[PDB]
Nucleic acid binder design. Structure first.
Lengths: 851, 86
RNA sequence: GUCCAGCGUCGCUGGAC
């Protein structure tokens, strides 16, 4: 039972408290040390990596042994911590230890009160030091000398050594025995430090430990990394061979036992120095408590608000869940447990700092993700700098975010799920940067619609489209130089990371995917259809060129804003769904009066020309060759009026867009293949399921998009806390509007019983479903199925769509005419041209097959 | 400079034997790990300052750069006559 | 509508009456 606060009078950095939280670990370590000297190989290890707070722990046990209350006769006296790296080179460790040991004894010798005792010990203690210095010459010599033999036979006076000779190990052994008598203790503790700076500084430490610190009165604790300590031993074993033998016997079979013999020698060496039962590892707070369904052996309590009682504080696991869930607009479950699971594996020193920063600013501030990014920026700037992301403190924006998303997935080399930002990588340098990225997407996209579509259309989509062309060109693993160069051209072509318009990104996205024709070379691609620009010679039915001038009213304003002219070796005309999302994302950010949206609306409806990407054949020859709208404008201006109220309450999350596009990509991909096989000479006007048309494929792409946002928003968008879908299964519309009508009706009933509307909760779908631009696309002249079994499903669907928007969209005269089977009126809200437009590559002369 | 100094600590005799692709790549990461830790420990990340080049000072013709520089092409040339570096 | 002309491995595009 322990509680840790965040507000303290000293304003302590990182809020580590006093002696941290590892009291149970420390007391177990202290007892083992104390029990180890109850004899009537004291080498310990403290595992750690990447500065995980090892130095604080070793100091903590020092203050718990040099500040004892003299409770028990057995006592520990700790020398000051020795740092091999900072130690001056060409100085034996035994000399440094004795020098530091001298200060403790000499100061305690000065502290006596009995004059007779002080004079007796000083004479004897000073005698042992004079004995050691005589033998210190024997420790660092390059040659023997025959006059050292006389000193080897010099028998000790007033001292009895069981073995003759010099035996410098014995001289130090009797020196430490006296030092304990003066200090009245029973054991001496020597604390070493890391060697992560100087790799080879530890070889003198290892040799000294096994040579001179092997006795009963001495106990040594050493911290470090066993990788660093193992390559030293293995390397020094190879330097112990005859050099000539290593040049003659290298027949690859004699060498087989050369490597084996070194490892066997090295493995036994490590066990002798550091026994396995004397190794201690620090525990992160996750393995103490936090895993669901298990009662952890310890409980950690955290108080956030200033000055609460030690009884009403919140649990550590929930001290972060409330921060993460609402700081990233997550709700609960497998989506938010992963983020809080990874954060609990981090060192206790680091996490308590960011918790202190977030909670301190939260209480004083009374955007929440803005407080989560700033708190995390000042605690994980190391990994951002190492990972090559944008470590700028300020100068932020959406354009700079697109590269961050793209430059992160490339390092993770996983393009399928890169735009999920879920920390599943196997490197600790990247698992701490996804959290920072997931915080920025929440902050930037919270409370806007244009800022939501732009990041989805540009940042989120580029990781998926590029995966369709990596497999073909510049295979990754075969050659890194060409693969890395292709990415540089790709990111600089469509200007990922510095955008001029989301619509402009659509005018260039069409060309990038147009360069992958299938076997049949039909003019249909993923999310678009290729339209003829020149009239053909023969027309089997009522087919003709597009003739944009046929359309009128707002329907014409929906065609001009959906056409792109790719300038290949021969001019190509396209109609794409991606241009619509770009068109919406542009006008949705004017936020001004009518006068501004007279030009803002005008600029969206303009002919644009884009160049084939450089990584294509026609990159060189293409260069050589190369007021009725006032009513429509008025219709749009009302939409901007009631967007802003809904616009404020939107709160997207990182996982929401990841699931919006994943369903959007799969559904839109699955539309093209079904609608490309079934198209015949008399297949116009539809009226069944097999018959298809240019309008039908066009209308069905956007309907395949609104279904994607509808399903995911009610399940992941954070305004609500429950799913209004039920406990069934869900699919996507592929040829029928059935699945887009069944789901919307269920929400209409299961939500009406709870006394709520479509804008207080589940707001985003309401804005998309009700917009003047997309309205003509939903119900065109030739894309309506006409069958008695399925007319009612679409007829009921018209009212359901009308119910959500709350306004009439199709007059009964026009609605009947579209569904009339019979074969001069004017339409200003629906299109009449794509009913019989010409499709590129139509090579199916057979007609509709009966049965 | 640092990475060159870290290789010196490895015993020379160790580097002729055990030259296998798997072994060479094992120490190649470890040295680069000591490279970044030592460098980050010495100079903290939250204090390094990158000096802006001529581009960020000026910026693009249509974009906005947070400075303004004018040059001289005449002795005693009036400051009004000075023109942008572009 | 027919013609001239142009690009691609017939398909596609440009111009005029």
């Amino acid at each position: 039972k322990i509680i840790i606060n965040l507000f303290a009078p000293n304003l302590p950095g990182s809020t580590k408290e006093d002696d941290l939280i590892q009291k149970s670990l420390r007391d177990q370590l202290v007892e083992s040390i104390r029990n180890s000297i109850a004899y009537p190989r004291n080498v310990f290890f403290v595992d750690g990596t990447r500065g995980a707070g090892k130095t604080t722990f070793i100091n903590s046990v020092v203050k718990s042994l040099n500040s004892d209350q003299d409770d028990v006769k057995v006592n520990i006296k700790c020398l000051p911590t020795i740092d091999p790296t900072k130690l001056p080179r060409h100085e034996p460790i035994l000399v440094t230890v004795t020098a530091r040991l001298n200060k403790m004894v000499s100061d305690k010798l000065k502290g006596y009160w009995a004059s007779n005792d002080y004079r007796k010990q000083k004479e004897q203690w000073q005698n042992h030091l004079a004995q050691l210095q005589r033998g210190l010459h024997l420790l660092t010599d390059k040659e023997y000398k025959p006059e050292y033999f006389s000193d080897a036979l010099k028998l000790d006076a007033q001292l009895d050594y069981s073995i003759g000779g010099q035996d410098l190990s014995e001289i130090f052994e009797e020196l430490v025995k006296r030092a304990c008598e003066i200090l009245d203790c029973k054991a001496i503790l020597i604390t070493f430090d890391d060697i992560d700076t100087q790799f080879d500084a530890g070889w003198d430490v290892l040799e000294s430990i096994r040579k001179f610190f092997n006795s009963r009165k001495l106990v040594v604790v050493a911290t470090g990394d066993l990788r660093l300590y193992s390559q030293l031993i293995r390397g020094k074993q190879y330097e112990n061979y005859s050099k000539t033998l290593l040049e003659q016997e290298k027949e690859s079979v004699r060498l087989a036992e050369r490597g084996y013999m070194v490892e066997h020698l090295e493995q036994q060496y490590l066990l002798k120095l550091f026994p396995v039962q004397k190794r201690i590892q620090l525990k992160t707070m996750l393995q103490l408590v936090g895993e669901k369904g298990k009662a952890g052996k310890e409980e950690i309590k955290v108080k956030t608000e200033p000055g609460m009682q030690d009884i009403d504080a919140i649990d550590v696991r929930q001290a972060i869940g409330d921060a993460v869930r609402e700081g990233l607009n997550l709700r609960e479950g497998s989506d938010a447990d992963m983020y809080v699971n990874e954060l609990l594996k981090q060192p206790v020193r680091l996490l308590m700092q960011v918790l202190q920063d977030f909670y301190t600013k939260k209480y004083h501030a009374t955007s929440v993700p803005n407080l989560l990014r700033n708190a995390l920026y000042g605690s994980m700037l190391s990994s951002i700098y190492r990972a090559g992301l944008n470590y700028e403190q300020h100068r932020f924006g959406m354009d700079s975010l697109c590269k961050d998303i793209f430059t992160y997935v490339k390092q993770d080399r996983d393009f399928n799920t890169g735009f999920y930002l879920r920390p599943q990588s196997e490197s600790e340098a990247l698992r701490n940067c996804s959290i920072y990225l997931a915080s920025q997407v929440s902050e930037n996209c919270q409370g806007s619609l244009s800022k939501f579509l732009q990041m989805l259309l540009v940042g989120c989509g580029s990781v998926s489209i590029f995966n369709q062309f990596v497999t073909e060109l510049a295979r990754a693993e075969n050659d890194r130089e060409k693969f890395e160069q292709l990415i540089s051209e790709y990111v600089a072509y469509m200007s990922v990371g510095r955008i001029e318009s989301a619509s402009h990104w659509a005018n260039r996205c069409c060309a990038v995917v147009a360069n992958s024709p299938n076997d049949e070379k039909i003019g249909v691609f993923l999310g678009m259809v290729q339209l003829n620009r020149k009239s053909r010679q023969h027309m089997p039915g009522g087919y003709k060129k597009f003739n944009i001038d046929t359309e009128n009213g707002l329907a014409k304003a929906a065609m001009a804003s959906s056409l792109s002219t790719v300038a290949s070796n021969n001019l190509m005309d396209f109609c794409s769904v991606f241009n619509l999302i770009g068109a919406i994302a542009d006008i949705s950010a004017c936020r001004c009066e009518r006068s501004a949206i007279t030009n803002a609306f005008n600029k969206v409806i303009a002919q644009t020309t884009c160049i084939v990407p450089p990584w294509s054949e026609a990159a060189v020859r293409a260069e050589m060759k190369g007021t009725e709208f006032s009513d429509a404008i008025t219709k749009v201006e009302q939409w901007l009026k009631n967007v802003n109220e809904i616009e404020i309450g939107i709160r997207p999350s990182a996982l929401l867009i990841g699931k919006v596009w994943s369903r959007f990509y799969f559904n839109l991909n699955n539309v093209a293949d079904q609608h490309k096989t079934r198209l015949y000479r008399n297949a116009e006007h539809g009226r069944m399921a097999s018959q298809s048309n240019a309008a039908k494929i066009m209308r069905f792409n956007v309907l395949a998009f609104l279904h994607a946002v509808l399903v995911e928003e009610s399940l992941y968008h954070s305004v609500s806390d429950r799913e209004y879908i039920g406990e069934g299964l869900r699919l996507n519309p592929v040829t029928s509007v059935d699945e887009f009508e069944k789901k919307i009706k269920i929400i209409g009933e299961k939500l009406k019983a709870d006394n709520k509307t479509w804008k207080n909760t589940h707001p985003l779908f309401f804005l998309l479903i009700s917009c003047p631009i997309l309205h003509p696309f939903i119900f065109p002249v030739g894309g309506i199925n006409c069958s008695v079994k399925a007319l009612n499903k679409e007829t009921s669907f018209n009212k359901l769509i009308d119910e959500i928007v709350g306004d009439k969209l199709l007059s009964d005269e026009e609605w009947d005419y579209l569904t009339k089977n019979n074969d001069q009126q004017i339409f200003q809200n629906t299109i009449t041209s794509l009913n019989s437009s010409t499709i590129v590559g139509a090579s199916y002369d057979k007609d509709t097959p009966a049965r």
